């Protein structure tokens, strides 16, 4: 209904989307550098320090291990009772979130240009270089090829054994993490301002102009519609022929990829300050003022509750 349920203070800007636990944990990482363990009630369980701001979400594996890059270079490994399993260095800042493989490795992109491949053990399986930093999460289709977009412009797939398998060339860095649709599209946002419908095989199936830079990665409903957020400060409805549906502005950049309800809402943060919900048809149905802009897309739990981090610092718990 659009009412603060609660809200967990931590000591920096939240910039990373939190993740949920089978049991109803939620993890989120703050540019105090701290990993956080929070209850569902809203209380702290614990908390874990890097040594620089965590601007990227953290993932759960299948065991519970929580995995989380921090921009002092590496990825942690972090048991579910809140002491650390490992940690695997890289040679610069992390700023995106790991995803993890059938098979369990855990995929990560770091500044330092590569895209690692790396064994639930901790040890490194392989590196990918690219051309620039990697500040974008990988994501992974159903047959095992890892897509990653680079500072480099481009789209890289690449074979789970580390072989590339093409690149795609956008105008401008690619930020934004890929999303598959169900007949293997691949969707990807560029700052050269435009979203990026990509064929298995690598070659362009069509593109959309929007008017910024594009720092977020799309969604697709489950009607096909694929929701993406530009910097122009709109949330765009595509349809899967490269047309516009419908488009929702908000009133300052849009850096936050948006999320989709059970009843099919769209949610999503703005510069703004303001978490938004969205109908299916383009109306808004309720906003919610955070205390600063929303740069961490939110998160749905199985009650319905909506997470958002803010720059103001806090974590909060949104009713539906």
Known sequence: DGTEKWRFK??????????????????????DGHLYAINPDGTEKWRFKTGKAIEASPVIGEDGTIYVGSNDGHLYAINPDGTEKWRF??????????????????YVGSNDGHLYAINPDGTEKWR?????????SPVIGEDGTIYVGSNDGHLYAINPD?????????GKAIEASPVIGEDGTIYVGSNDGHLYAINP??????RFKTGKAIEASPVIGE?????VGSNDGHLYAINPDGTEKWRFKTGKAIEASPVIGEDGT????????????????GTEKWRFKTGKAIEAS???GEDGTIYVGSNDGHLYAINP
């Open 201 to 206: 095989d690598g070659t362009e199936k069509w």
């Open 128 to 136: 990918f270089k690219t051309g620039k930093a990697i500040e974008a």
């Open 298 to 300: 939110p998160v749905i």
């Open 266 to 281: 769209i949610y999503v943060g703005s510069n703004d300050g303001h978490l938004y919900a969205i109908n299916p048809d």
């Open 89 to 106: 260095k890289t040679g610069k800042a992390i700023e995106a979130s790991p995803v993890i493989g059938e098979d369990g490795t855990i």
């Open 10 to 31: 931590t000591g920096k800007a939240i910039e990373a989307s939190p993740v949920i636990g089978e049991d109803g944990t939620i993890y989120v990482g703050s540019n």
């Open 162 to 170: 580390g072989t590339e398998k093409w690149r795609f060339k956008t």
């Open 223 to 227: 009607d096909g519609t694929i929701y």
